[PDB]
Amino acid sequence: LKASSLRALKLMHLATDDTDENVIALCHQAKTPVGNTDAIFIYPRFIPIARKTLKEQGTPEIRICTSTNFPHGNDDIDIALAETRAAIAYGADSVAVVFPYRALMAGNEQVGFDLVKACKEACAAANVLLAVIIETGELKDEALIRKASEISIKAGADNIVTSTPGKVAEGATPESARIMMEVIRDMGVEKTVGFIPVGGVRTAEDAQKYLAIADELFGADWADSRHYAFGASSSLLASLLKALGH
């Protein structure tokens, strides 16, 4: 439980609305007595001040993740793309674009493909990772979750993500995480696509079990910081630190 808790802590993308003050506190929160989270997750406009804060406290390696087409997942590619370009300009390490899940649910699979592909173009050129949030809690159905993951991967997603941080009453479940990870396995893209459960993981016990699914599916070496991340907040961090004696 200690080994798993330290491992999970180091995979966290820590999130808190964001304000200058909140974000500064978040950066400090990411540097713990036992090590640093891999990243923080914030709105694009706070990327410059977070980068400064991280540098000043001597943790320049803590990455900054953000989101676009957020939180609604509308089907306007031009807007999603503009937002993604802006996120890149602010200095994002990764952009998580929200998939147009309502469009998919209405039977339009093409727009999700074109949207993700356009954003991936723009991120790849800037050496920024593109994650895709499919919003499993809105899709609900296994087939829709599989299809959104597949479309996302075919369009070039670097990571597939369950849910939008903070989405009321919606988060990763062992079932959705399993489905999404099976898509990665089945499509043969484990080297190039990672997974991010957002929500659903509140305890050290939870984190241990989630990682066990990853280790089971892909072997124990797979879920490094590039291929797995816990998108979570203070509750999980606190639980992990307690498991570790803080």
Tell me the technique behind this structure: X-ray
- Site of tokens 């304000």: 19
Torsion angle, alpha carbons of 165, 74, 157, 232, to 10 = 0
Q: Are 94 and 39 in contact (CB under 8 A)?
A: yes
Kindly give the pairing relationship between strand 159-161 and strand 129-133: parallel
Distance of alpha carbon 184 from alpha carbon 98, whole angstroms: 18
Q: Are 243 and 1 in contact (CB under 8 A)?
A: yes
Two tokens at 64? 């900054």
How many C-beta atoms lie closer than 10 Å to residue 96's C-beta?
A: 32
- Header resolution in angstroms: 1.7
Q: What is the CATH number of the domain that holds 187?
A: 3.20.20.70
Range of the domain at 146: 1-246
- Split into its structural domains, the chain has a count of 1
Interhelix angle 142-154/174-187, nearest 10 degrees: 40
Kindly give the pairing relationship between strand 94-98 and strand 129-133: parallel
